[PDB]
Amino acid sequence: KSKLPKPVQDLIKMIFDVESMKKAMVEYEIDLQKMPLGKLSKRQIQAAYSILSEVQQAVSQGSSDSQILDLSNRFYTLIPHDFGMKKPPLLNNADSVQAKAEMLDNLLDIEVAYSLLRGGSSSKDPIDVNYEKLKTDIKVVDRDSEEAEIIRKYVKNTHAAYDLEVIDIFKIEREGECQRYKPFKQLHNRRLLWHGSRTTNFAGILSQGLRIAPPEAPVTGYMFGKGIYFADMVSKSANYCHTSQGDPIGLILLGEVALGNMYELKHASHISKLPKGKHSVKGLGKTTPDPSANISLDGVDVPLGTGISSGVNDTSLLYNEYIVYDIAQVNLKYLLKLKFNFK
């Protein structure tokens, strides 16, 4: 049996849960006979990304439907689906490419999880064995600490279709992140920010850290180009947990992010290089946390102030977001297990 505290053991169970992996592939309508969970290829996913990028290129120009259909067909030939009574949906627009790209993102992290879970060598509990494979130190933050109270206040005030309840707070330290982050600790404007993702991605996120979309992947849906995205509103990030009322539990990260000088934008702009002297993008929202209630936690700004009007004139965004284009600018500090109370 395992030496780990019960919440840590349950975290390990939920992120390595194989039923959840197969359930995800079934909901994507993947043919599990043609492409089993155990036979996912990073190389196969890579090629699929490029097909999707070519599809998006064709769509953007305006191309022969015969060309769009041959590309769309090439994708489903590479990634095998079983749509039952229906015909495969034609990949001929932006929303459709994005959905399939976001599905590839998820499949890659599932492959990382299943690879971790299958690999390795008797005396130890499988919970402990699989814990160590995350290369991440995970401690339970006590409910009656200033840390947990600051964090719980952050969840209450920046929650603006569900109520949010914090079940467990874990303090986390990924191997190598301390060293990788240390130069960026010199930048001013360090902020504690939210980052949400599906539960089936968290074995990948913890072993590899938050990553940037590969260049093969379509840029569709990335308002500010390929980067790592964060919110100062727990609601905005919690939507990326994709939590179903079937299983109303999600996982969400708090990261220390070294923003430096922010390139502040009101509208979509696919970034490929920041201006000199800029180290992050800030998307400006209609609503921002009240800056008078900014508090500090271990030298990092926590923007937990309740939502007020920002006064930004012509904004496309309801809330702020923050993007960095270097993976070393992120120091993952906490992992929250959240209960979504839908109402």
Ligand SMILES: NC(=O)c1cc(F)cc2[nH]c(-c3cc4c(s3)CNCC4)nc12
């Ligand atoms: N995860 C977050 O917490 C988050 C927070 C934000 F404030 C804005 C975000 N945007 C995204 C995107 C993820 C993906 C996109 S946008 C486009 N297609 C591939 C996958 N995540 C956030």
